[PDB]
Curated annotation (Swiss-Prot), chains A, B:
Function: A 'suicide' enzyme that participates in biotin synthesis. Catalyzes the formation of (S)-8-amino-7-oxononanoate (DAN-carbamic acid) from (7R,8S)-8-amino-7-(carboxyamino)nonanoate (DAN), a function equivalent to the cannonical BioA reaction and the first half-reaction of BioD. The cellular requirement for biotin is thought be low enough that this single turnover enzyme supplies a sufficient amount of the cofactor.
Biological process, per Gene Ontology: amino acid metabolic process; biotin biosynthetic process
Annotated active site: 121 (nucleophile), 191 (proton acceptor), 195 (proton donor and proton acceptor)
Subunit structure: Monomer.
Coiled-coil region: none
Keywords: Aminotransferase, Biotin biosynthesis, NAD, NADP, Nucleotide-binding, Transferase
Annotated EC: 2.6.1.121
GO molecular function: NAD binding; NADP binding; oxidoreductase activity; transaminase activity
Effect of disrupting the coding gene: Loss of biotin biosynthesis.
Effect after changing residue 230 to A: Decreased product formation, still able to form a BioU-DAN conjugate
Protein name: (S)-8-amino-7-oxononanoate synthase BioU
Length: 328, 328
């Protein structure tokens, strides 16, 4: 596959998409050929120049401003029809809550076939993609949903851990995030503030940077989120592991420190066939960033998705359903 | 599937096979219809009476002595041709080191198609099954190898954990086992003593219970095993995650205490795309027995294997390659 690498694209070029591009750079079996943001796109069948695209984006507002870039207010539509791309990572803020589904309906409408991957967080966003299962399948698209850190990595770990038990009692995810680069987080931070007490997507999305800084001042830069609406729950339910109500997700983001404020882990509790109650724990290393734990799994699921696609398996899959494949 | 459960069988009815039978009892989507040991077999398309089979085995030396049992010195051959069985768990001591492969060659020769699962430990035993890949595929058999605790559960956890990293440095497995029931462990204990310093399969297999008790007396019932030949290594290599030399397996079995002498875990170390070195850790609950952590995953892989089989996917798969499916 070093002779014929998987040709991939990234939609959305905020902090996560940019990290995704950097992660792809040293891969030999995967090549980044396509990036789109809201106001432009960049295609390069020979492989994207990541430094140039990042410069363009951060200094001129869009990758359409990069060498070989194209400005466009229909960048996704234009990009889909421009290039030979085997799969895309949808690194798109789900703002509003319908956006990911709407982008997916454009892939469907386009006639394009291949693999799509997302790192959606919200159960209700994942439910919108579930409504599209047959449309995806009929379109010839293998869609990998919730394939980030959580849902994703931690969800798959819980699916594996569950095999020791006759019955599952609880899957509890606690995450920590330290923000190293403010620019890389603003434009997703409202997605998180929406999980705050007395907030929601519409309210958070409409906040000014002034109002955000004010909220953060109160809690010293810390967003402690409990019992989040998080698609891990329906994913583990669709995989037959447990009911969604037995899955709980919470976490802490420290907007003022690059160090994780706590060690991310998932605890899986259940009863074994011998009637013993016990828990497995999967814990992430403190020096693995949000970016690595989201984008790493995302492309491992893209690779896995492609394997499925190449076997004629189309439709919607979750992180809980298949083994991601290590990308080299 | 409660109307048409997967009909499964177990070959070998020492401690692990017996535990496997008990684990299957409450399942509604999987039904134990077939058990064989060296000197007899038991088939019952309506579902095995586990208490009766265990009584027969432990009190009369074979399940062939159970109500509906048949004595036979070709029990595997006879069983394969007797019943409608969708998949078998091969709960067989690999003694000698060629035995599992030889049983597998009988399934091949028989014309039977379906799923086979094992919980093999040794790299060299797994390599013998790798030589049979095409024979398996041509025979219409989906073979799931190394699908126990380690290899198996812990190997799959390492495969998932690896997705955060650009390069893997080390996968380190440390296991603990407390023996609760001596009868349930003797007849596999020689497999472990073979990993001892200054021992091997042939030497260990030829030891008398006298000589075993003597060895154990020296170390107070404790078998501390380091750098074991363990198939986790080639499995993670075949899945493209790391070289076999970066996988190390050790553990402790306490023959004199039902409590685990240490907490079983796997530590996965690597470098992320940002150049940070870090480790994830997956730890098992102390009250999850060897039996639960081996047999639970084994049947989850059988179920997964069947899914593959039903899609026309035949040949050899490892725990590292696919997501096991929770059996209810
Ligand atoms: C709050 C985040 N946006 C996200 C979780 C990131 C988990 C990272 C795990 C780690 O790197 O340890 C959850 C969310 O967006 O709801
Ligand atoms: C020594 C064992 N036979 C076996 C490991 C059992 C791991 C159980 C894990 C747990 O229950 O914590 C390894 C071996 O046989 O080589």
């Amino acid at each position: 596959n070093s002779l014929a690498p998987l040709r991939v694209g990234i939609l959305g070029f905020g902090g996560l998409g940019q990290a995704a591009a950097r992660l792809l750079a040293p891969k030999q079996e995967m090549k980044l050929v396509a990036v789109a943001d809201r106001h432009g796109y960049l295609y390069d069948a020979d492989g994207i120049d990541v430094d140039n695209a990042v410069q363009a984006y951060t200094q001129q507002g869009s990758v359409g401003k990069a060498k070989k870039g194209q400005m466009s207010e229909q960048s996704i539509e234009d990009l889909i029809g421009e290039g030979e791309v085997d799969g895309y990572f949808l690194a798109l803020p789900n703002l509003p809550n319908t956006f990911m589904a709407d982008v997916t309906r454009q892939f469907i409408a386009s006639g394009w076939q291949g693999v799509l991957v997302d790192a959606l967080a919200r159960t209700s966003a994942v439910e919108q993609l579930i409504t599209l299962r047959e449309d995806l399948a009929q379109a010839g698209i293998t869609y990998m949903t919730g394939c980030g850190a959580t849902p994703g990595l931690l969800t798959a770990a819980a699916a594996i851990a569950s095999q020791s038990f006759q019955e599952i009692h609880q899957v509890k995810i606690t995450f920590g995030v330290g923000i190293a680069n403010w620019e890389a987080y603003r434009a997703t931070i409202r997605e998180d503030i929406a999980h705050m007490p007395g907030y929601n997507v519409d309210k958070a999305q409409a906040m000014t940077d002034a109002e955000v800084a004010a909220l953060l001042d109160q809690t010293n830069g810390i967003l402690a989120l409990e019992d989040m609406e998080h698609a891990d729950d329906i994913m583990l339910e669709l995989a037959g592991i447990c009911h969604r109500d037995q899955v709980t997700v919470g976490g802490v983001v420290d907007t003022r420190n690059p160090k994780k404020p706590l060690s991310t882990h998932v605890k899986i509790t259940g009863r074994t066939f011998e009637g013993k109650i016990s828990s497995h724990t999967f814990t992430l290393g403190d020096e693995t960033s949000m970016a690595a734990n989201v984008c790493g799994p995302a492309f491992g699921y893209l690779k896995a998705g492609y394997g499925l696609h190449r076997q004629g398996l189309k439709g919607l899959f979750t992180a809980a359903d298949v083994m991601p494949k290590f990308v080299r």
